[PDB]
Structure 1
Amino acid sequence: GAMNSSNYAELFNNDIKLFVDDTNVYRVTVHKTFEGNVATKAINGCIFTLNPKTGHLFLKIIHTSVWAGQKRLSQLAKWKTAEEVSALVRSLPKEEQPKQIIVTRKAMLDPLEVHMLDFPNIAIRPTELRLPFSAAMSIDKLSDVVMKATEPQMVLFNIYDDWLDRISSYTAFSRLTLLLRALKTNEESAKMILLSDPTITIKSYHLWPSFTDEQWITIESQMRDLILTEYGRKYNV
């Protein structure tokens, strides 16, 4: 059934699984019309599909042309997400196809289940965790490739850079979700923390900076301060 705190180590076992997050698929700016009415303008989006064990990110870019002439876009976006996930699975070799797919929002269950009827042995699961994957567009290089797309495109990343050389996938996922939770609660502060020291760079082939183990503990600590901070600035505590 649903994925929660109690079965959390299941993410890092050897059964292939994927998280699918659809928050950033349908993205709009809301603005005023010359006549003083309101209108939306779509911008490029992305499906965030992630193997939590390996760090492999299948970033399907959703170009605004896919909404042209379509109605009820928020609903369509869930079915479009499900169509693209199903296409991704069929494109993988059998031994690489996931055994489970965990959706971060329950409204993706039925669309994905229907698109995956051909794969009755792939379990489609919800989760009770409040995962911060919406903040993926606060990662500069991911945001940059989505916004520059002129056509539908799939781009492959490792969201853990080279971390798994030094840490386990449980620890790497915990670092990722802490970075993303921080970027989500206070993006400016989060990014200040990450780039404050000009001597620590982001390698061309990476998404995050090249921190030593000690600098990662400093960084991780600063992000927890931010999240507690903002949690006080918010609730006044």
Structure 2
Amino acid sequence: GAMNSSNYAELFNNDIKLFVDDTNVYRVTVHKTFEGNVATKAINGCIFTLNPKTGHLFLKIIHTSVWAGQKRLSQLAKWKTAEEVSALVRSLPKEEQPKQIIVTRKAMLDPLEVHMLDFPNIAIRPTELRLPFSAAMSIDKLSDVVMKATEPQMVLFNIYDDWLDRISSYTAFSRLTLLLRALKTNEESAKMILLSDPTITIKSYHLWPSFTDEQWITIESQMRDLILTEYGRKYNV
């Protein structure tokens, strides 16, 4: 069944699962032509495939060349996503393959199901949650590797840095979703929060700053303020 508020703790049990977000696979800028018509120019995208228990992120970079000469790109993007996820699963040892794949958008269900026909025991699940994974391209190191890519490429990250040494995966995922929600609602403010205190650096092998436990509580508070604020600045409350 669908993944929602009520079965959120299932994300952190010992059954391997992956979130798949396709919202940054097909990315375009819209511009005017010399004749005054409108056209798109594709830019590099990425599939965001995340193990929420371990933080392992399989970032499949989608190079603009995959769109060359193709029609109905937004539809193709869903099938390309499903093909790459299926290829990823097939590349993993049997004991690392997921038991469930949760897609963040319902339009991915049929493409993924058809591509995973060889894996009848892998459950493909939607979610009722409005998850903020689109904001992954607001993480500077992820954005940089996607935009610099000259060819299709898979890059492996741990999106939790070393947090699991000190917190649970429930707490890690909740922190991640809070950071990404903040970045999605007001990227500039969210980014000011994370970096303005300059003494707290980002290790070369990390994505986020090296906050202490205490500093994370302050940061998380500031992100929650941000999200409520922007909710007022938007709704006038």
TM-score bracket relative to the smaller structure: over 0.9
- CA shift at 1:130, angstroms? 0.4
Question: Residue 224 of structure 1: CA displacement?
Answer: 0.2
Determine the C-alpha separation between the residues in 2 that align with 1:185 and 1:216: 19
Note if 1:87 corresponds to 2:63. Answer: no
The CA deviation string for residues 49-68 of structure 1, in whole angstroms up to 9 with x for no partner, is 00000000000000000000
Q: CA deviation at 1:95?
A: 0.1
Distance 1:93 1:182 in 2: 36
| Cα distance in 2, alignment partners of residues 176 and 4 from structure 1 | 17
Shift of residue 163, structure 1, vs aligned partner: 0.1
- What is the Cα deviation at residue 141 of structure 1? 0.1
Deviation at 1:221, TM superposition (A): 0.2
Following TM superposition, by how much is the alpha carbon of 1:193 offset from its aligned partner in structure 2, in angstroms?
A: 0.2
Task: Tell me how far 1:138 sits from its aligned partner.
Answer: 0.1
Gaps of 5+ in 1: none
Output the TM-score relative to the length of structure 1: 1.00
1:159, distance to aligned residue in structure 2 (A):
0.1
Encode CA deviations 1:162-189: one digit per residue, 9 max, x unaligned. Answer: 0000000000000000000000000000
How far is the alpha carbon of 1:122 from its aligned partner? 0.1
> How many pairs are equivalent?
237
**Which residue is 1:102 aligned to?**
102
Aligned partners of 1:2, 1:198: CA distance in 2, in Å? 42
Query: Cα offset for 1:18?
Result: 0.1
User: Residue 110 of structure 1: CA displacement?
Assistant: 0.1
Question: What is the CA deviation profile of residues 63-99 of structure 1, one whole-angstrom value per residue up to 9, with x for unaligned ones?
Answer: 0000000000000000000000000000000000000
Counterpart residue number, 1:12: 12
Supply the distance in 2 between the matched residues of 1:196 and 1:215 (Cα, whole angstroms). 13
Q: Distance in 1 between matches of 2:198 and 2:50?
A: 30
1:191-231: CA deviation from partner (whole Å, max 9, x where unpaired): 00000111100000000000000000000000000000000
Measure the CA separation in 1 of the matches of 2:59 and 2:38. Answer: 31
Counterpart-to-counterpart distance in 1, 2:132 and 2:149: 24
Show structure 1 runs of 4+ deviating over 2 A: none
Where structure 2 has 5 or more consecutive residues not aligned to the other structure, the ranges are: none
Residue 39 of structure 1 deviates from its aligned partner by 0.2
Write the mapping of 1:26-175 to structure 2, written as runs, cut at 5 A.
26-175=26-175
By how many angstroms is 1:150 displaced? 0.1
| CA distance in 2: counterparts of 1:157 and 1:9, whole angstroms | 23
TM-score by length of 2: 1.00
